[PDB]
Design a protein around this ligand. Sequence first.
Ligand SMILES: Nc1ncnc2c1ncn2[C@@H]1O[C@H](COP(=O)(O)OP(=O)(O)OP(=O)(O)OP(=O)(O)OP(=O)(O)OC[C@H]2O[C@@H](n3cnc4c(N)ncnc43)[C@H](O)[C@@H]2O)[C@@H](O)[C@H]1O
Ligand SMILES: [Mg+2]
Ligand SMILES: [Zn+2]
Length: 215
Amino acid sequence: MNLVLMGLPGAGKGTQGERIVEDYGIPHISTGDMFRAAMKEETPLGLEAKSYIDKGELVPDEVTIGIVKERLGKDDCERGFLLDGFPRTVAQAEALEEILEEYGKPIDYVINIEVDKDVLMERLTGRRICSVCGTTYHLVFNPPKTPGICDKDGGELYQRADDNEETVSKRLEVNMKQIQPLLDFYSEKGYLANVNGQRDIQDVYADVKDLLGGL
Ligand SMILES: Nc1ncnc2c1ncn2[C@@H]1O[C@H](COP(=O)(O)OP(=O)(O)OP(=O)(O)OP(=O)(O)OP(=O)(O)OC[C@H]2O[C@@H](n3cnc4c(N)ncnc43)[C@H](O)[C@@H]2O)[C@@H](O)[C@H]1O
Ligand SMILES: [Mg+2]
Ligand SMILES: [Zn+2]
């Protein structure tokens, strides 16, 4: 089960991905998460990516493709994987084609979680994340049982640094320019699947899960 999740900032990649990996046990690979992990560990990669991430800009293709190529070669991707937020540019998509062709693991489905851009600002500014496990909540749409703490581990919740009005707007602008070219690319490949992500989380997942049977 080789999957790719794409969508505009805040569309629900992390939320849907969490559910996919629990049911199928494939590794959840988020380039966003990888960059932030690096930023925390303060590796040279982390510091370099930080400049772009903080501004809402895309981290350059070369270094991004590099960390994904290495990640996909790990033993835990033997039975499949869930790419989240990558590819994000046609260039990345073409590179991934070569990478998976070398690894012998072609993509089964590219799932595009479609959400109207006009509601994404609310989704991100209201997002709260667990500092311990990374699962996300929303002040209005999916609030924690107790304000400021994770239902699972009791860890303190926080607001991602780039989830502010200015940066969110920038992220939306930047990623808007990549959507259509990416959709056309995979639609041409023959395995693009569009899912209406503007419904309750479990309703969205039902459609996502419908695509995974037999993989
Ligand atoms: N390939 C690449 N190339 C170059 N640069 C790269 C790169 N990949 C990453 N980067 C860099 O890294 C940065 C960060 O990347 P990344 O972390 O991947 O940013 P993103 O694409 O903007 O996605 P988000 O994490 O913000 O949102 P999501 O879709 O997972 O949503 P979630 O499930 O949390 O949901 C959001 C909120 O909505 C709520 N929610 C979820 N579903 C619903 C629903 N159905 N109804 C109502 N609310 C919902 C949630 O509770 C939550 O509060 C980029 O800006 C870029 O700089
Ligand atoms: Mg995410
Ligand atoms: Zn947690």
